[PDB]
Amino acid sequence: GAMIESSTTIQVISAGLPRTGTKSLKNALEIIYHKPCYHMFEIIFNKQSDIIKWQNLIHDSHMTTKTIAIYDKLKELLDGYIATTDLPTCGFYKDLMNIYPNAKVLLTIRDKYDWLHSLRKVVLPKSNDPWKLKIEEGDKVLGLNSDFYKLSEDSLKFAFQKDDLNFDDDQVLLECYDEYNRLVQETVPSDRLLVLRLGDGWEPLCKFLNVEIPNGIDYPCVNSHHQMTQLTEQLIKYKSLDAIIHMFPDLI
Ligand SMILES: Nc1ncnc2c1ncn2[C@@H]1O[C@H](COP(=O)(O)O)[C@@H](OP(=O)(O)O)[C@H]1O
């Protein structure tokens, strides 16, 4: 197909929750558009200064005139990106739809129990889980402090629309997961939505986006809980990111 000059603006809004293939999608979108895609990894590795901006945004977003102030902040944060995935953005998908009226919406989904088990190993271990101590240690090596965890928890609460949330309760999380995914499919016009099951790969995505399947490039498969466990252990061992970054080429 012909090469065309794509606009550097948000073209794709992904509503999928963490641990649903969002980093693979981020990588795939960057392969298609040759511009960056937002993801929690963007905050952790490139823009930790964004953390307080997202926290402020979530704080203001329970609240027209104040709507515009928030929408402007949302635009500032996403400037120069061509897509959004993952926390903290995914909870804002309805607002992003208004701000970027020509952007299409994706929903990444998977088996709810596989999701919960992935989440527990990586994002939200039970507070009695000894692994949680390793996660906290690896996080410190990356320079992630209490404000990062606050942003993580608050943006999940915001996505699930729940003033508080027993994070140690599987049944609660499973119910929020199903309800969240259900509400996305109800809220977004089917013309504007593509639902992607883990493992679907390039074809339905590229069709939806009217682009050619990348030549000879397999659809990304990254950010497994096994890989994140290795990253955590390596961070603990070497006490820096830069010491090991060459060992995780596509992941980061
Ligand atoms: N192309 C692909 N095919 C199958 N699973 C994939 C995949 N890309 C990512 N995943 C899975 O999606 C999860 C990561 O999602 P996210 O990037 O949103 O955190 C991981 O699940 P597991 O932890 O169960 O291995 C990872 O294995």
Ligand SMILES: CC(C)NC[C@@H]1CCc2cc(CO)c([N+](=O)[O-])cc2N1
């Ligand atoms: C030791 C290091 C690997 N820990 C970082 C971890 C794993 C990556 C990660 C990803 C997300 C969302 O994709 C969130 N989140 O939901 O805020 C938190 C974290 N925290």
